[PDB]
Fold:
Amino acid sequence: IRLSRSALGTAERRDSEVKPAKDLADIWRVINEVNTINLPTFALYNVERSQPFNRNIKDNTGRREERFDAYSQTLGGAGRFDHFVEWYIYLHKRTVSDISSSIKELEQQVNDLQRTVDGGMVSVKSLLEQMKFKLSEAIERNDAAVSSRVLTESVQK
Amino acid sequence: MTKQYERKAKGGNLLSAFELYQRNSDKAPGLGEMLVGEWFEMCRDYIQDGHVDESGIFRPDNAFYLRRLTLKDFRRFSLLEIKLEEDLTVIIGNNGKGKTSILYAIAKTLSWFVANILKEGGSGQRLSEMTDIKNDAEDRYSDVSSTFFFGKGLKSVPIRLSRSALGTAERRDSEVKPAKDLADIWRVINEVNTINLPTFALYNVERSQPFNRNIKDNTGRREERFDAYSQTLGGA
Amino acid sequence: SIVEKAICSVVPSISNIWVEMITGSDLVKVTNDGHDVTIDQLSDGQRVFLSLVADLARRMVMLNPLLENPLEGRGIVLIDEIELHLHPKWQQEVILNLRSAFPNIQFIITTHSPIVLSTIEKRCIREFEPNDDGDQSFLDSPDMQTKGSENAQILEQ
Amino acid sequence: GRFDHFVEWYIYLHKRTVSDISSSIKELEQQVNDLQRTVDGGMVSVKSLLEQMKFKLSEAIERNDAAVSSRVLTESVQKSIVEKAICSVVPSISNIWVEMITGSDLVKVTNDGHDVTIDQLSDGQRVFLSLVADLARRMVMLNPLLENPLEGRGIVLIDEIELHLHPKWQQEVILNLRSAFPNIQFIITTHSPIVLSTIEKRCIREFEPNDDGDQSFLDSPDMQTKGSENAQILEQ
Amino acid sequence: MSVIRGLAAVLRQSDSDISAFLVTAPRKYKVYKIPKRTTGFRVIAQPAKGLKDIQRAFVQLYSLPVHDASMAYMKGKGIRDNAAAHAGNQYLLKADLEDFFNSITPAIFWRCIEMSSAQTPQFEPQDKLFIEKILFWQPIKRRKTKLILSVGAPSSPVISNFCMYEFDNRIHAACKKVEITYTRYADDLTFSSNIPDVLKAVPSTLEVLLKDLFGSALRLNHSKTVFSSKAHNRHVTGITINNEETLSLGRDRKRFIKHLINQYKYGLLDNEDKAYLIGLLAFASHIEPSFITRMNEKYSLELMERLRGQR
RNA sequence: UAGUCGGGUGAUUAGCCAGACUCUAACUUAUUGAACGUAUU
Ligand SMILES: Nc1ncnc2c1ncn2[C@@H]1O[C@H](COP(=O)(O)OP(=O)(O)O)[C@@H](O)[C@H]1O
Structure:
């Protein structure tokens, strides 16, 4: 892989040659898409690593959980320690709670609201428009946790 | 072929002379010295020739200016043609007639010249696919055709900017190759031997902004020559 | 020297421009109507026009190193609403000053003013028909000779 | 002026006019009636985590009495007042409304019989539109107790009132502003005699050509500018 | 067997051989680049020898109608006739079509076949696929639907002339009423008239007629629409029209030829340039016979005779 | 006035001389293929 640049006004350019790197990364990405595989970890730690810790953490829940968040600002020179704190607290919340019950109460609201479906209004979809397939998407997301795939929160922690 | 290019170049054509110079230079050093050749001298003389007129002003032998501008389905124009003057052209009208649109189209056309002067095969600005195409339209695409004059050796440099509207299966392409060729001539000749480069500037309503020297603006060493093409067609 | 001469010749109110280093922030000073004033206390109309002229002169000087007068180089300059923030007294001479300073530049200019048109030949004007919806083609020059004409007559015709 | 704030406020008005509160409070009451009867027997688990919407019902009861206790105008009435202020002052604009194009709500206007959006507006029309729209929004929001909120007290300062305006529009920029906002004290500066031709001589303060700041009072011109020739105002 | 039977009777080959050949026929093309005269390259698709013979036989077998306003690719007509059609006039409106040859598809060909106002040879529905395979070139291997005419082929010129027969007829009929003469060298719509301010409305008529006939497939090149008069240069498909309303090669080309003959006079002209000069002189004799007489007077008759040679 | 046309001179694509024109307004292009001219034939 070659990273090239040329000055302004030169008669001929110097371009990059990143095609083999793109080919290898395409192999990695496609293989991972079809079947989960282990991915390399690229990180850079500069002298900006030494920065103060600002106590509280911004609760931007919804993105520290995805697998590809490990590549977020991975080569910025300073490790995302706030991201680590959010992820660690998220793992603790899923370990101490939300796992002893597991899928026990989440599917119960469907049966409970079946009463409103039958003996309430003629047809109810507005009240039950999300969780019906939200349970299915949670199941197909945690299938990695329950199989030889993405680890459970307790073992990760 | 070499014979036809020599016949055209000795007649005053600049493109043929540059083609001969390139084919000599990229060949063995027996005929290619990158300069001190008949064709390179022809090209640099064509670019650099001039004379001081009776009033004391240097007048180049081969003037550079825009001849025609065609706007097809561009903003409010279904099909418009203009006959830009060699020295000064004034566009007048009421509000919302398209004068700013005409200037915007001309600036977009000149952006390709600027980009290919700065950077080989560089990409200039393109027409917006959200606002530039006429709202009514019939084909949901817009064209901006321009013709430039660079002396008797290059009487026409046709460049067309085209864009298709959002959600259109057929996309229209732009014909910007002659502008790239002319800017390649300028850039190559300049790097081999310093020449005078054209100035392309746009001063739109985005000027008159308050304050001056807002930030230190770490942007590329204002001292160097090719900093004169940086944000030259931005409007301010 | 070339840039200073261009700035002083084109802009009517400015008589001189220089840089002071004492009071050791670098600052640029001009002379408006005989008063030495800094660059930030300019008005809108003398600062905008000066900005245009100075930028154009800088680019002409930097792009034309082999010319005795770099401002005599070739190029295309687009100006929108040239009479911006200009008093009618300034509008009577802006076109002439610009054409004198940069004689080889192709100026393409839009304006809403009869005062500026009074200094421009009829052949150089491209007008829009008042009752036009965009179907008109191949714009035309006016009939009445605007150069040297009365401002009221230009407004009328 | 905050024209983006005006656009957000206008889209809010459109949404609350096309949705209204009488078509949401009754639905909330119906849902509460259904759920309370459903949870009457027991198993209040279907309401413990559904209590959020029941409390949001009382929340919506709040911030709604303020719309009845402060005597604020109806959102549709405010929209109509702002629209008629915009259309009657800006010459090119005929009507203005909001559409749900590709989901997002965007504001469209009518220029010379065509239905371009705000981003397609020319700089001359867009600036005047932004000025009048911001002023109308501020007057409507600050004057809830008037039948016409535009007839309220205030002081508005405009610099270069004729900015980006064609001479045809300058003949009617003062009269339209005075008619739309009768009770505002307008303090303006101008560079055009066409605007001065529509202004009383008593309302003009002039700086002498030979003035370095040593003067002590701003006098009115000797000639009556209202109804005078453009050449006469230019000369005297 | 219709088309294949006639092709077999012409080529003296079996039906099976031709039918097997006409399977990848839209694909049997050799594409190459030729140098442009100023700069760049032009891409041309030329079919193989067997497909070339098949196309020639198909062209000679079936005679598609062509209009008199067309001047390209017919016997006895060419550049001189196209230029002399507008020789005596005062104003011209040279115009061009956008990507003329590659914009013609089998859909256009079959649309033009059915609605042609003149006599059209009868093609059975069974052999339409063979017609498409014979006449049309298929760029892009994966896309079997994209079939276009290739500029440069034994069959492309006649198909292109036929596909514009209705356009030529209607344009000529419209132009004769307004005292405008119209010719087309297969990409160069030339309109000329002695009436002022009459050519302004021609481009709009061309656009509406093209939309009516070919829809969006064929479009005018708006950047190639040129208005000219006796105040400016006037040339039609390479022949300059003088202010004396006569055909000419142009002053610059005449001076170039004079310089070449002068170089030959002192023996400073090599064999390649000598052959080029002989070809240019033959072309000049075709276009400007008086130029040959002028050169005979200026450079003596014996020098010219030795330059052109003897039989 | 430009710009254009091009008859002549010119070791000749340049320079010059004479003449003429002016719809708001040429920008000379592409092969081996097609037709045209020319040469072998
Ligand atoms: N895509 C478009 N389709 C149709 N009309 C448009 C489009 N974009 C802009 N317009 C209209 O065309 C005009 C553009 O204004 P502009 O070019 O800035 O003119 P000016 O400088 O003369 O005021 C306005 O009237 C605007 O409403």
